[PDB]
Design a protein around this ligand. Structure first.
Ligand SMILES: *[C@@H]1O[C@H](CO)[C@@H](O[C@@H]2O[C@H](C(=O)O)[C@@H](O[C@@H]3O[C@@H](C(=O)O)[C@@H](O[C@@H]4O[C@H](C(=O)O)[C@@H](O)[C@H](O)[C@H]4OS(=O)(=O)O)[C@H](OS(=O)(=O)O)[C@H]3O)[C@H](O)[C@H]2O)[C@H](O)[C@H]1O
Ligand SMILES: *[C@@H]1O[C@H](CO)[C@@H](O[C@@H]2O[C@H](C(=O)O)[C@@H](O[C@@H]3O[C@@H](C(=O)O)[C@@H](O[C@@H]4O[C@H](C(=O)O)[C@@H](O)[C@H](O)[C@H]4OS(=O)(=O)O)[C@H](OS(=O)(=O)O)[C@H]3O)[C@H](O)[C@H]2O)[C@H](O)[C@H]1O
Ligand SMILES: *[C@@H]1O[C@H](CO)[C@@H](O[C@@H]2O[C@H](C(=O)O)[C@@H](O[C@@H]3O[C@@H](C(=O)O)[C@@H](O[C@@H]4O[C@H](C(=O)O)[C@@H](O)[C@H](O)[C@H]4OS(=O)(=O)O)[C@H](OS(=O)(=O)O)[C@H]3O)[C@H](O)[C@H]2O)[C@H](O)[C@H]1O
Ligand SMILES: *[C@@H]1O[C@H](CO)[C@@H](O[C@@H]2O[C@H](C(=O)O)[C@@H](O[C@@H]3O[C@@H](C(=O)O)[C@@H](O[C@@H]4O[C@H](C(=O)O)[C@@H](O)[C@H](O)[C@H]4OS(=O)(=O)O)[C@H](OS(=O)(=O)O)[C@H]3O)[C@H](O)[C@H]2O)[C@H](O)[C@H]1O
Ligand SMILES: *[C@@H]1O[C@H](CO)[C@@H](O[C@@H]2O[C@H](C(=O)O)[C@@H](O[C@@H]3O[C@@H](C(=O)O)[C@@H](O[C@@H]4O[C@H](C(=O)O)[C@@H](O)[C@H](O)[C@H]4OS(=O)(=O)O)[C@H](OS(=O)(=O)O)[C@H]3O)[C@H](O)[C@H]2O)[C@H](O)[C@H]1O
Lengths: 181, 142, 37, 37, 37, 48, 37, 37, 37, 46
């Protein structure tokens, strides 16, 4: 009589113990994938970053109309897709955020275009050697940049790494085809 | 509990920047560009609240939909489909809060403390320090 | 029958710790290679 | 159960290091523009 | 998990030092051409 | 384990997310969130 | 009558676990306030 | 009864962290005076 | 319970960093006064 | 790559072998073995 009661309850103990084991392991399984992902993206936030070689600009009449930045893959970074990066423009006039546009040259408006300089891809920095030129149109994001102005460009990659550049038009553009912003 | 406890820690909002528009001589808007933190699931900005600790006021802004903002905040998207929910790592939204409406028009040097509170409780903090010289600036960088 | 329950749960703890231990080591290994480069 | 606690703290530790890494780089980026100017 | 954090921050220090080194060399290069002329 | 992505759904594009729970006969479940690399520019094979 | 004994011990086990859960969080509550300060 | 086991283990890492906390601060204490002098 | 161990170490880590800041400032303070004279 | 900003154009030159060069540059070896890679401190490449 007493043994019969022990048998049925013993099954209950085994089933309950298996239930508790399931809760622990599956929860640990969820956290492992969440934890593993965070380490990769957070390291991606710090490592994948854009370095700006130099920023020159074509000169029309007597005011800069283009702001071309030569950007390169930073030190120890993975692929940097520029077509998914945003550029913030805080200048003497407007205060917008420029997103990528598939070809425009002169019709960039409130966007930016990336023409390749060195490499295979024309929007994806792969190796250290590859350099990409970012095309931004001055007299369409605001107005043609005047003599001795300033622009606050923060090229932000998709992973959050910000590269701040301060373009400064030369104080005088007397008979210059292009300057070094 | 395991999912939400991880959610409380994981889904966080990182503030890319904060630029305010300048009218006459006062930062009348305060725009915040937010992004998903490292390894964060879908963050909904509609069910989020912002605490405004400023010089003259101290309230907690909530969400709204479309100049006529007052004691709320509105989110206009910048990159990536939806205009209230962060889905991928590459999406950005702008948080609009009419500064002269939630209190008085922000003057030079006046600092504002913000705490964007996600739905699951994760908090981010920002100290927007208005430049102490607004003379002849179309838009500043708080 | 209290002893039976402990034995099964004990196996879960060792597995859970191994899962948590593995996550840290591989994550550091990724950061080690990333940092060295 | 101890393995569970390690993972949640591990996520926070990575996030804080990312936050600290942000301040160092952004401030350096700001000074670089000011310094070259 | 303190080892996890120090890896990420270590990367930040290296990048910041390269940023500061970049400003120094570039400014010296500018003045050298200005000085030589 | 061989699995045809272009037959269970579609050819996994960039940034795609697939969640797998390999469950043995007895019931034990192993979860693995496969993460397609963010950009597939010039990669013959990748590490999901 | 084995089931009857099973139930009473089960009641105590839930109460005992509640004590340990209480101590852990309340102690963590103190260090949280101390750590923030 | 698993709560009782947690309590003893709970007490352990309060002391262990305090032991780890103490050595870290004191080793900074020696470096404090040496650097200033 | 791993959180409890983390919190105590966090307090020590903050205090140690404060000490290092103190010596780095005060020694810079003395050198300024010696430099000015 | 070498950046040219003259009185007229402001382009970015890249290496195109065998020339005498449109918008490219060539590297002859003044002193050394390799004519495109500076290996030691003594090599001079034009
Ligand atoms: C920033 O980076 C962008 C990257 O695109 C760069 O863009 C270029 O800017 C040029 C200019 O400075 O505005 C543009 O120039 C024009 O187009 C050229 C080409 O067709 O792309 C050239 O075109 C020929 O010009 C002759 C000439 O007699 O005027 C004309 O017959 C005719 O327009 C074209 O004839 S063609 O060559 O047979 O096709 C010419 O520029 S040039 O080559 O420098 O002489 C311009 O008309 C260029 O298109 C544009 O992509 C910005 O300059 C940077 O600031
Ligand atoms: C680097 O980062 C850039 C950022 O822009 C990224 O660029 C995009 O890549 C997308 C994709 O290749 O990943 C391109 O997506 C396009 O739209 C897709 C979808 O409609 O959203 C796909 O569209 C196909 O269009 C065909 C066509 O006959 O019309 C249709 O059959 C159908 O709508 C789609 O079929 S599909 O191709 O078999 O899926 C398609 O991309 S795909 O699904 O990956 O194949 C694209 O047309 C997007 O245009 C592009 O800017 C780069 O990919 C990154 O490397
Ligand atoms: C050396 O230093 C001199 C300092 O004078 C500098 O050249 C001068 O710069 C002035 C200015 O740009 O700082 C030029 O001012 C001109 O007049 C302005 C104003 O009217 O007083 C502006 O005039 C524009 O004219 C247009 C036109 O269509 O008539 C009108 O739309 C409107 O009146 C003005 O529009 S605007 O250009 O968008 O402002 C204009 O200067 S501005 O306001 O800065 O734009 C100039 O025409 C002055 O002519 C110029 O010589 C040199 O450049 C330095 O090298
Ligand atoms: C913070 O972030 C918020 C995000 O919304 C941003 O808000 C915008 O700021 C603009 C400006 O103040 O910078 C506002 O611009 C005005 O409204 C626009 C639109 O109606 O929303 C435009 O409106 C037309 O402007 C013409 C023009 O001749 O002035 C007028 O006839 C009339 O006001 C409007 O006519 S319409 O187009 O036929 O409707 C115009 O801006 S524009 O589109 O950039 O040219 C402005 O009048 C904008 O409304 C506002 O949401 C803040 O600026 C950031 O600080
Ligand atoms: C982030 O959080 C936001 C929070 O708003 C969420 O966005 C949306 O929130 C809406 C709401 O505020 O909850 C949801 O609205 C949906 O549509 C409403 C309306 O039609 O516009 C409501 O629709 C019901 O539909 C039934 C149905 O039988 O058709 C009708 O009886 C009637 O139209 C509505 O009845 S109701 O549900 O009893 O009200 C309803 O919302 S409600 O009125 O608040 O109840 C919703 O179906 C919307 O779905 C939601 O997306 C974002 O999605 C989050 O990411």
């Amino acid at each position: 009589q007493v043994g019969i009661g022990t048998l049925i309850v013993f099954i209950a103990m085994v089933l309950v113990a298996a239930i508790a084991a399931g809760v622990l392991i599956n929860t640990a399984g969820y956290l492992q994938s969440k934890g593993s992902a965070t380490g990769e993206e957070a390291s991606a936030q710090v490592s994948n970053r854009i370095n700006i070689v130099s920023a020159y600009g074509n000169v029309x009449x007597x005011x800069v109309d283009y702001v071309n930045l030569t950007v390169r893959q930073a030190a120890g970074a993975d692929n940097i897709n520029l077509x998914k990066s945003t550029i913030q423009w805080i200048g003497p006039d407007x205060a917008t955020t420029l997103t990528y546009x598939x070809x425009x040259x002169x019709x960039x408006x409130e966007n930016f275009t990336t023409x390749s300089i060195k490499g295979x891809x024309x929007x994806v920095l792969v190796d250290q050697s590859d350099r990409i030129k970012v095309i931004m149109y001055a007299x369409x994001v605001x107005x043609x940049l005047x003599x001795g102005x300033e622009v606050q460009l923060t090229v932000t990659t998709q992973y959050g790494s910000k590269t701040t550049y301060w373009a400064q038009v030369p104080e005088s553009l007397k008979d210059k085809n292009a300057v070094x912003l």
